[PDB]
């Protein structure tokens, strides 16, 4: 019920089978670079490692699971605090110093709006979006170890059909909205005069 | 009244659909190699699982609007069935009464 804001997210995994360090990063909409998952969790509001791993892995037994995460942890000892966890998330241009608090107030609502717009887009949810981002990771890995196959793409029930209805919507929405700021553009020219 | 349930592709994953209502759960004879059957009748895989949840309406219903025009589609090499499907749609007839 919110137009068509296709804001896309990607969890990556660096280095192929047998590489050195298998560092895990992510595509975050409106930011220039891929950003290590640990910093992302911190920037949310889960600060300590080993609780970090409680949104990700779900059985504190299966160790290969846990072992795969080592290098991610060792990537984010450079960032440990609620505050500057959003500092890294700051590089998308140059604030030029002028926006030091305001780049947070940029990074703050980027993790309100663009990051996982479903689940909710409200203010006071963070543990909703973590457990999920912690569920994107349990899948990613729970494949690399080769415990379940790659996801099929010709599967039918995992595609949809834009019938005539939502077609019209995806159109009417657009047109109505265009009519909507035609009135706005006629109002700025009223008073000015009266009128009637 | 709970007899039919609208089943989606995904949900299709967790179900075990029977094929023929009658001959997919009667009793055992067994019939696989025992005297006697009709030589000329085709060879049905059988029912070998017996834990079903659903049951198929009628097979023929996998077909489409032009495909059901074919008679005995299951005796033709597929492309023949598909090939016709394209022509039923340039064939000539009663396209509306008005």
């Amino acid at each position: 019920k919110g137009s068509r804001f296709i804001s896309t997210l990607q969890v990556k995994l660096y280095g192929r089978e047998g590489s050195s360090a298998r560092t895990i990063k992510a595509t975050l909409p409106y930011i220039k670079q891929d950003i290590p998952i640990v910093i992302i969790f911190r920037a949310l509001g889960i600060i300590p490692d080993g609780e970090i791993l409680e949104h990700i892995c779900y059985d504190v037994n299966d160790w290969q699971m846990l072992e795969m995460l080592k290098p991610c942890v060792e990537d984010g000892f450079v960032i440990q605090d609620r505050e500057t966890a959003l500092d890294f998330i700051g590089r998308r241009g140059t604030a030029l110093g002028i926006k030091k608090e305001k780049r947070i107030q940029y990074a703050k609502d980027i993790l309100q709006k663009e990051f996982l717009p479903h689940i909710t887009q409200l203010e006071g949810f963070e543990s909703r979006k973590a457990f999920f981002l912690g569920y994107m990771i349990n899948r990613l890995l729970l494949c690399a170890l080769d415990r379940k196959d790659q996801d099929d793409r010709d599967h039918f029930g995992k595609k949809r059909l834009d019938l005539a209805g939502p077609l019209l919507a995806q159109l009417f929405k657009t047109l109505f909205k265009k009519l909507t700021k035609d009135i706005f553009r006629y109002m700025q020219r009223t008073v000015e005069e009266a009128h009637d | 009244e709970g007899l039919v349930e609208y089943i989606d592709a995904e949900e299709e994953e967790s179900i075990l659909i029977a094929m023929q209502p009658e001959d997919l759960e009667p009793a055992e004879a067994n019939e696989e190699n025992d005297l006697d059957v009709d030589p000329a009748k085709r060879i049905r895989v059988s029912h070998h699982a017996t834990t079903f949840t659903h049951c198929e309406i009628h097979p023929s219903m996998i077909l489409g609007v032009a495909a059901s025009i074919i008679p005995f589609p299951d005796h033709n090499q597929s492309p023949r069935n598909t090939y016709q499907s394209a022509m039923g749609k340039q064939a000539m007839g009663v396209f509306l009464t008005n």
């Binding site: 019938l163 005539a164 | 039919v4 209502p21 009658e22 309406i57 009628h58 219903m61 609007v65």
Partner: peptide
């Protein structure tokens, strides 16, 4: 006898019932 199950033919009546209802462009209408 109303107890006994469907069989061969009976399957078809269920079909007709369906089309009697939704007709044929149901999706496009719906």
């Amino acid at each position: 006898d109303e107890s006994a199950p469907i069989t061969a033919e009976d399957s078809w009546a269920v079909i007709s019932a369906f089309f009697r209802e939704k007709g044929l462009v149901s999706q496009q209408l719906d």
